[PDB]
Design a protein around this ligand. Structure first.
Ligand code: HEM
Ligand code: HEM
Ligand code: HEM
Ligand code: HEM
Ligand SMILES: O=C1NC(=O)c2c(NCCCc3cc(O)cc(Cl)c3)cccc21
Ligand SMILES: O=C1NC(=O)c2c(NCCCc3cc(O)cc(Cl)c3)cccc21
Ligand SMILES: O=C1NC(=O)c2c(NCCCc3cc(O)cc(Cl)c3)cccc21
Ligand SMILES: O=C1NC(=O)c2c(NCCCc3cc(O)cc(Cl)c3)cccc21
Ligand SMILES: O=C1NC(=O)c2c(NCCCc3cc(O)cc(Cl)c3)cccc21
Ligand SMILES: O=C1NC(=O)c2c(NCCCc3cc(O)cc(Cl)c3)cccc21
Ligand SMILES: O=C1NC(=O)c2c(NCCCc3cc(O)cc(Cl)c3)cccc21
Ligand SMILES: [K+]
Lengths: 156, 156, 156, 156, 156, 156, 156
């Protein structure tokens, strides 16, 4: 089906963000696992898988709209050097992702691509859940202290 | 069955306390969940449900006695701004509630409304169990430290 | 996540309508049960539970958006003195509630809070189902007569 | 297999009656459900499905006989404005359908299309069962009164 | 519940498209079955059922909004004389249907009938899935050749 | 455990190849699915998953050896424009991948990193199986013809 | 099958390291159990069992090669006086063991005893997994503090 060219551009921008998130979350997961913080590693693994599923749906939508999905361009990963920074790097990426999702939904609504809007809204709901998770973890570090926070994330 | 007017007034006073407790505990529960203290959130949710069941039985009793249940007037919620304050606000409310239950039981006894007395005694038993829980939590905070106490209430 | 202040105000306005509905439907349910109209009592109970679940989701969303949920201010209950009035009071409340929901959705859309919109849309779907039920009940009273209508709601 | 041209015209006339009946019963069903008369709504839905199955078999036979099934021409639906009129409208349509079935069977017999006759006889048995149902409902309205009749059709 | 007059007109236009689709897809299905192309027959049958379910929901929504569903007016069916034409006829109908859905969604949005919009968005998702299927089939005919394409659709 | 710096560099080069392969195979899979060649799409999907698992093991090994896995640098994807080109592009990437694996194993052996060698040997066995598959597909296209080959890959 | 004499000498050296490891890990396990750190005790017990199984395979290989397995000479156990030291003593033993495994593999390769090499490679894989575990435990002590680390290892 011949899609709106600018919708396809927005879908590729969202996909670009997902590709960053896949790799950033996967690396964070395996760093946490290496450090013995296996509950964080498993949770971050599932975040990465969730972003892979989002990327799959975006690729499929772009192709249906007769666009070319961009899996070639990879923006800057935000990694960081300890648990607090890794969480804040994830949160910075998510806030950028949700900004782009909202701008994409505006445009889908304006050109009447209501199915693309529904897909992006579903993705945004997942990203807002991730934001809730991250903000909560950063708050917990403050409430229980870093030592206890990390302790509580050693065992799955 | 025509009830004693003052019994019905006592029952509506107890009901008023329950309506405060339902909302205060439900809000406390959701604040704790939002902060990632899900064991506290879950326990406080069950306390709110318990008060909902008490309120149901009082409403049913008032109607049987041919009175009008007062679900319109809501007294002051005691919310507080951190875990210790929230627990103490709950405890303050409970101690007011048990005082009111005792005065109502005295009056039921005097006018021979033994079934209303039995209902209020059952509610009083539940409220004293709540008081036991709350006093114990406040004492645990002192014994294990706030950070450990919160850590232990992160996961269900 | 820092929410739009007016979104939060709208969500609290919706929450305020739910708190009225919880109590109005609960009291109606227990009145109908006391009168032996247990099918009405049970259906109205489930309506009250529905509104409790809506209020829960609203409270959770307001807290995520870093607002304060208002569980303190309870507006006017619309009770009524017989079955037809009780149903009409529920319907008047629902029509106010759906008006407020639509206005809230407009503002969510305007500020790009698409997740709050989706939550409100889901609540609106539930409220329109309640309106369908209420309008149908009122029409059935006209078609079968009040005595038959009440007869048909004695038993579950 | 090359069918008799006039047999095919008869099958298309029967099919045309079925297409009217599908829509008329389906709309009646959904009207009754909307009014809270869900036992009538469910029964009328099953009448509509029955006519759909008849239409399928007619379409399949016409194609086997190398004719063109006519799904384009829709005759006048008989809707009516209350339960008694809706039942009478269905019955009027059914009596027209059974007259047309009888004439089609005569013709099938004359040209020795005994398999088409057997199909039409099966459909005629179904339609006489519908007529029995409709005549019985109209008679019940007279015997129990309209308010009781409708009351008995509120719940499935 | 009193619906918006122009929403009801849009819903009846959508329903009119569905009534065309139901019959067009049903006839196409039975033509393919008659020709021994049973996998196409089965798939097209399920498409027809899908449109029947959409029409049911539209009819129910129109009646809830106190409008009259139009099951009387049947537009032009697009049939076609061979497999390629039949698929292109379905695709032409679907492209008209999605245009009309998008215009109806615009109008529901403007009058704040967000529940009608959600229903129409769900129907639109289904129709874009049909378009995906149709465009894919027409493309497969080009890649594998007509004779192989038909061969692959003989057996369910 | 402090690894050999040049081993870690080899492992990061292998990982780099895997990241290309993940995206190339995933896009190919979704292109084939979009075109209705679902058997090719499913097989290529599982190839993508295989490379994801290889990348996981490489990341875990690099981190164990106290290196930094490179998920930032993405080399050129080889995307075909038709099935035969897509298969040849996969094959060209695989032949580069196995050359790099062999050179990495030579170096692992020279510095006695026998566990890293064992990991790479396992990956190489997988890649030779992929090469076997790809060479076999390209051969089949020649033996059965492209139209038949594509026909055989329509259905899962 | 008469083996290479220096292979057998290497296998006996590896066996000697395993006999030290068996006893050192078993004593550490029972020390941790005595101290109430039963999760550490259980994990170290399973490490001891692992080394017992390695020793068994070495004994079997040496006998097959017509050598005499040396179970008589026991080198110095590295015990240590607290958890951190005990883990470090285990890590120091493991690093000597893997050095010895690497030299043994070099010699097996030179004299073409590829089966002995494969056995040692499998043992080396196990020992590198132990090193991972130990390094991670030492890292966790730094990140969560010793008191939390030991707390998390009290219960299995
Ligand atoms: C374009 C980028 C990627 C896409 C579209 C993608 C897509 C997917 C999908 C759809 C799944 C199946 C998830 C499920 O249904 O449970 C999956 C699984 C997985 N992915 Fe990815 N992925 C991508 C990149 C990566 C990368 C870079 C890695 C690691 C470096 C990775 C590691 C994994 C793993 C380990 C699994 C689970 C496999 C299993 O054991 O079943 N993925 N991926
Ligand atoms: C007049 C005030 C209320 C009364 C009499 C009442 C009564 C009840 C009762 C009898 C139940 C069934 C519990 C059970 O038996 O398992 C219930 C459930 C529940 N209530 Fe309330 N309630 C009140 C107010 C509220 C409020 C204000 C909220 C939220 C703000 C709320 C949230 C809930 C929830 C989430 C459930 C569980 C529903 C489910 O999933 O089953 N209630 N309530
Ligand atoms: C040419 C006209 C039609 C034909 C030939 C037709 C045929 C059929 C058939 C063969 C079935 C399967 C019944 C079974 O064996 O269980 C069916 C189901 C159904 N039809 Fe139709 N139909 C027609 C028109 C319609 C219309 C106009 C509507 C709505 C206005 C409708 C609504 C339904 C529904 C709701 C179902 C059941 C779907 C389910 O089971 O979930 N049909 N139809
Ligand atoms: C301090 C000396 C040792 C101690 C205290 C010890 C202790 C144990 C214990 C408690 C078990 C588990 C028994 C069971 O399954 O119920 C076990 C199993 C075993 N041990 Fe030892 N052991 C020692 C030395 C050795 C040595 C020197 C060897 C071989 C050279 C060996 C080989 C084995 C084997 C093969 C098993 C069976 C484990 C399995 O496959 O499940 N052990 N040992
Ligand atoms: O990421 C990428 N998405 C792409 O479509 C793509 C390429 N398309 C070539 C045409 C395919 C029809 C070529 C290189 C890289 C990419
Ligand atoms: O692809 C990428 N791989 C990376 O490692 C990486 C980056 N690393 C910065 C240091 C992270 C770190 C800190 C630490 O204390 C321990 C460890 Cl293991 C790692 C930055 C951008 C992109 C990439
Ligand atoms: O909280 C509230 N409790 C109430 O009763 C109530 C109200 N009652 C109005 C009369 C309803 C009634 C009529 C009847 O015949 C029998 C019964 Cl039991 C009750 C109005 C506003 C608010 C409230
Ligand atoms: O209905 C009510 N809703 C309320 O919030 C509330 C009150 N809140 C005072 C501050 C509570 C708070 C502190 C905090 O540190 C974080 C959060 Cl989320 C909330 C007081 C009386 C009645 C009500
Ligand atoms: O399709 C049709 N929808 C209709 O409401 C309708 C009719 N309404 C009659 C009043 C209810 C009459 C004939 C045909 C139709
Ligand atoms: O209701 C309708 N019934 C119809 O047949 C029909 C139409 N037929 C067009 C001829 C296509 C055909 C070609 C063929 O080779 C075999 C067959 Cl059976 C049919 C056109 C519009 C509307 C209708
Ligand atoms: O460890 C030992 N292995 C052996 O074969 C052996 C002996 N054989 C004679 C005698 C004493 C000790 C040992
Ligand atoms: K602790």
């Amino acid at each position: 089906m011949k899609g709106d060219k600018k919708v396809i551009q927005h879908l590729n921008k969202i996909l670009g963000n997902e590709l960053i998130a896949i790799n950033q979350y996967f690396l964070h997961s395996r760093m946490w696992n290496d450090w013995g913080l296996k509950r964080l590693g498993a949770h971050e693994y599932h975040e990465s898988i969730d972003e892979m599923k989002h990327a799959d749906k975006l690729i499929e939508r772009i192709l249906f709209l007769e666009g070319l999905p961009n899996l070639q361009d990879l923006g800057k990963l935000l990694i960081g050097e300890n648990t607090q920074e890794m969480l804040q790097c994830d949160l910075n990426l998510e806030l950028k992702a949700t900004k782009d999702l909202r701008e994409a939904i505006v445009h889908c609504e304006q050109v009447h691509d209501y199915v693309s809007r529904d897909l992006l809204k579903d993705i945004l709901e997942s990203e807002e859940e991730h934001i809730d998770y991250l903000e909560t973890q950063l708050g917990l570090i403050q409430k229980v202290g870093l030592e206890n926070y990390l302790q509580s994330h050693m065992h799955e």
